[PDB]
């Protein structure tokens, strides 16, 4: 994993460059929006369990996936569903603080589309629950912070489809 700072040091290190004016622009962009990210990271951490309760109620709680024979039928199947939404919300907050989507490829999306196909989990329903969690969060934290969190929700959705 690398954040917005480590991402700029690593890209200049493989070229042998001192930090020029173009690397200093990317470093200034993160330092300016840095106060906005520590504010949303503390607002999502305190409403973590109730964000996913409201995001499931808007997408999957009132479909028929929980009907007998569905994926989310048993209690074990239902408890594992909401544990993933715990994963996606917690790893999209690591990505919004770092300012880099690098941690999602390393610790989330690695072999995940094959894991859902082996188990039978609907991929399009998970993307629909993530799109609801993206909308529930964008109203809690605001428009600027909510538009950054929605940048790393789309990254999990694109790497899952």
């Amino acid at each position: 994993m690398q954040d917005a700072i480590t991402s700029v040091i690593n890209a200049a290190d493989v070229q042998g460059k001192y930090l020029d004016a173009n690397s200093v622009e990317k470093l200034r962009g993160y330092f300016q929006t840095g106060e906005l990210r520590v504010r949303a990271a503390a607002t999502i951490a305190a409403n973590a369990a109730t964000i996913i309760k409201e995001a499931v109620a808007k997408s999957l709680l009132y479909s028929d996936i929980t009907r007998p024979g569905g994926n989310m039928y048993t209690t074990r199947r239902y408890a594992a569903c909401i544990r993933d939404l715990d994963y996606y919300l917690r790893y999209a907050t690591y990505g919004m603080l770092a300012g880099d989507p690098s941690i999602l490829d390393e610790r989330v999306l690695n072999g995940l589309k094959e894991t859902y196909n082996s188990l039978g989990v609907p991929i399009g329903a998970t993307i629909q629950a993530i799109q609801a969690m993206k909308e529930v969060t964008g109203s809690l934290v605001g428009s600027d912070a909510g538009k950054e969190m929605g940048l790393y929700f789309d990254y999990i959705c694109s790497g899952l489809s």
């Binding site: 479909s63 028929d64 009907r67 048993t74 399009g124």
Partner: peptide, 22 residues
């Protein structure tokens, strides 16, 4: 495998196709 087990064949839910009028 176990007692409550998932299979594509015994899944009559509209969960793999998002027909949201059902």
């Amino acid at each position: 495998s176990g007692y409550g087990d998932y299979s594509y064949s015994t899944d009559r839910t509209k969960g793999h196709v998002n027909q949201y009028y059902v």
